Structures are given as C-alpha cells and as structure tokens.
Amino acid sequence: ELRVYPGNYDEYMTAATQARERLLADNAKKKAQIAELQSFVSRFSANASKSRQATSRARQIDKIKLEEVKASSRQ
Amino acid sequence: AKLHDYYKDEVVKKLMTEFNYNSVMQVPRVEKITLNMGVGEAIADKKLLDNAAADLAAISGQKPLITKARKSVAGFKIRQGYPIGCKVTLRGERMWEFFERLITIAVPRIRDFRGLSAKSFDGRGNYSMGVREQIIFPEIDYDKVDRVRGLDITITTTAKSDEEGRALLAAFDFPFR
Amino acid sequence: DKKSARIRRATRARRKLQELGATRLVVHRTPRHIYAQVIAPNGSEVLVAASTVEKAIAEQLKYTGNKDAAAAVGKAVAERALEKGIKDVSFDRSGFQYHGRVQALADAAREAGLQF
Amino acid sequence: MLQPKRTKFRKMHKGRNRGLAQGTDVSFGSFGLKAVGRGRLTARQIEAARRAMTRAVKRQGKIWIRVFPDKPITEKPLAVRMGKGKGNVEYWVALIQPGKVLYEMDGVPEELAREAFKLAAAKLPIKTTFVTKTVM
C-alpha cells in the first residue's frame, strides 16, 4: 500500500526503518511471551492441582494472534 | 518405383521357386519403414527436438511426428507428455524410394563398412538397424548438422519368419555377412 | 480385426434405437455392393430390404458399389417401405462414416418420401 | 518365532473358533501329530515344540510345520482402566480346530518319530494324537 510519511528523505528513512524494527520487536514480544506460557502448559498440565491453571493460559496463548510481517519489494 | 517393379518382376518368382509356394501373395512383402530416434536430451533443450525433426524431414520427405513419454519414469527424470522422440512412417512409393536411396548410397558412405548382421530379426521377419550417425545420408551437407544423432531404421514385412525375412531382404542385394 | 472395431463403433447408436423402440433403416456397405434393409423395433424380423445384388437393380447400373449406385438402391427401399405403410424410420449407420456412399443412400431415400 | 511380515491390518477382531479343521491329512511327510482338542496355539509353543523334536531325531530327517499364527492377540497393560482404545499387539496365535495336522516328519523309522512326537506333544496346550500317512 501507499503510506505517506511527512519528511524530506532522512526523516522518512529513520521513520520507516524504526517503525519496522518496532514491528519486529513487538512481534518478538509475543513470540517470546508465548514460549514460557507454553512451558507452563507443558509442565503443569496433567497435575491435578494446577491443571485448571494450565488450561487458563493454554487458551490465552491462542488468543494472542501475533501480527504478520510482509516482504519488502526492494531486493 | 524401380525397387517396387524390380520386386514385382523378379523377387516374386525367385522366392516362389525358392520356397515352393502355391499362391502369388504367399511371398513376403515389405509393408512399411519406420525411422525414429528418441533424442532423450530434449528434457532441457526443446530446440534439439526441432533440429532432429528437421534432420528427419530432410532425410525423408515427410514431417516427423513428435513422440511423447507414455509413462512417467523417475530414472531419467521424465514424466508423462514430455516430447522425447521423433518418428516417421513410410509406406508405398516413398518407402520404395527411400529403400533404394538407403542401400544404394547411404550404406556405402558408412565409415569402415563391413556388413550388416543377419541375426538382427525379431523372429517374425522384421528387420531393425541403427545408422549410428545422420551425416552419411546424402540429404546432409556435413556442416549444417551439429551433433552425432543417429536414426533407428525398422523394416516391417509380412514375412512369417526371420528365415523368410532374410530371404526377402537378400533378394534385394542387402550387404549381409 | 477391421470388422470388430466397426461393429463396436456403432453399438451405442444401435442400442439407443432398441430403447427408443423406433423402426431403423440399417445400412451395410462393401467395396463391391451396398445393402439397406428396414428392421422393425422388435429387431428380429424385417419388413423391407433393398440391395445392389438383386438382378432387377444391378442390371441397369454401370457398376454396383458407388455413389450413383447407392442412390439407385436408396430409391428402391423408399418405394417398398412406403408401399407397406412405413413412413417414419430412423437411420442407422453401422459404423460407416456418414460421408460417402451411405450419405447418398440416405439422401436418395430421404428424397423419396421417407422421413428421418 | 513365526510371525507374518507386512500384514494388511495391525489389529484383528477376537472372533470365534467353531467347526472341524481342513488340513486333516498327512501329505508332505509320512508321520504326523494330529490335533484332537480346540484352542489357540501361540508362536512360542510352536518353536518350543519344534526344538523338542528336531533334537530328539538328532538333526536328520525332514520336518514340516503346517500351521502359522497370522493372528495378532492384543493385551491391555497393567493398572489401566477399561476403554480408551484397543490394546496393543503382544503375541501371535494360530487357531486350531480338532483335526488339524500340526507337525509331520519324514526320513525316520516310525518308533523314533513316535517318541519325538511325544516330546513335542508335552509343550502344546491342546490334546494331540499320532497319525500315519494313508493311501486315500
């Protein structure tokens, strides 16, 4: 799509690079906050005293829905 | 043409008295000539098949039919429908003309020619032969060609045995052993 | 077999006329003669048959077995059929391509009052 | 231990075992060990009853085994409740009907086979009998 950044060119560069590394960072913040939730769900799952708690976040794992990363047209 | 009426006038009588037949058309007669080659290397260079088809069109006055792989085989990395070979079927006047022009000039032009084998029959009077190179034919100028591609001539006769096929082909001055 | 292929070329067309229950005009062609007979929907008994082997047809014909000879028997089968009251038949083919002598056999019979 | 290789289906129904057997004659050999009872006869009771009679005849003579298990018998593990799927295959048995000719042997005098077949009939759950080839 056509996304307009107010800037001459060196503001556009530091905007469209920072706002892409921010996309990667805010996606890694989900990809790594799913990991330890899955560690809990994989460890205390069959345990009778903590199964109701493992199943509480095994369902918040699948309600996170990380945002996809597209491919740049420049190669 | 010349070979056809030579057959009619002489070979019928010769074979009739040789085998003691009882009918005019019990003598074996050649029914077709098939010239083909499976180029194989048309997997990646489709122009090679066109060049081979042009070679066959020059050799015999027909447009070759391009033959495609019947069944996918993983050994040669081909699958169904890939154009693989070219084939030409000659019957009648053209068959006789090519029959004359092969065994009169093209076979003599074979480098270090010694003789065609006599035990190269499929057991039913049919003959097969590999020319091993397309340059010998007079239809080629030795400079247009680019490869060593060779044909596979197959003479299909109505003979009932390889013995009668040998007799029929030796009645036509074939260079056997 | 050059004849088994033909006999199985016309089976689908033949077996539909048994299901429709329609009188059919089968056609047989040979390199020397050409026959044409009208067969009831029963399929086991014939009503009218004309052919080029009859002495009353081939005697005034130059050569039996060509287009103008087919038109000579196509005329004959149409007069005999109309004489017994058969008018609405269907054309069988028996595997022969509807292009040559059979076409003139059908066209001549069509022109003589037969409806198909 | 006899067991089929590359069988179509992993687990098979229990089924029933009714009727009389088919291979009731001594065809390959001369003396046979014909079954008289009924019941499955597994793959270890075949080898255990085979070694016992390829050793009582030293090593000479031919021996034919006319049965093959080809029947997977599952078994639920220990301390597992019922349900939750069929158990896994543990051994293979050959269903035997009264009349089946289990083993037969040739190339030995009769009184040697009649003793070798006695040391094999003691490893089989089912009753057995000694039968001799006949003219038919």
């Binding site: - | - | 299901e19 | 939750k84 799927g85 069929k86 158990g87 896994n88």
Partner: protein
C-alpha cells in the same frame, strides 16, 4: 488406540420396490452407488444412477446381456 471413531450417516440404499410390485410412474425402484442394476425397459437412470419407473406397471428383474448384468424392466400390465 485413539485417532479413530469416525463414521458417516447411513445413506439408506438398496432396492425399494422388489420384484412383482405395482409401481406408479416416476417411483424410485433402487437407490444405488454404482450401476449394479442397469436400466432396462421403461425405467430411467438418474445422476446418482437411481433407477426410477417411467410408466406404471409391474417391476421385473432380468439378467439380460453378454456380461450377465442385472437389468430392471417394467411391464405396463
């Protein structure tokens, strides 16, 4: 164990009007999957190879054919 326990609803196939029954035109005779019984006289063949009557009468099963194929036919009696 597990990874099983699936099946489909029964399709209620089979012969609906057995031999000798009086049918009305358009009444289904057999519901098929292939063509086990072929269409004979005065019966049709739907897109599911369903054989339906075409003129009212008595059903009749036959074994006509060089390949011994079952044919369902109807006599307007």
């Amino acid at each position: 164990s597990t990874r099983n326990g699936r099946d489909s609803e029964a399709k209620r196939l089979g012969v609906k009007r057995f031999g000798g029954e009086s049918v009305l035109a358009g009444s289904i005779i057999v519901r098929q999957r292939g063509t086990k019984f072929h269409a004979g006289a005065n019966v049709g063949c739907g897109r599911d190879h369903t054989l339906f009557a075409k003129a009212d009468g008595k059903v009749k099963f036959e074994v006509k054919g060089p390949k011994n194929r079952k044919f369902i036919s109807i006599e307007a009696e």
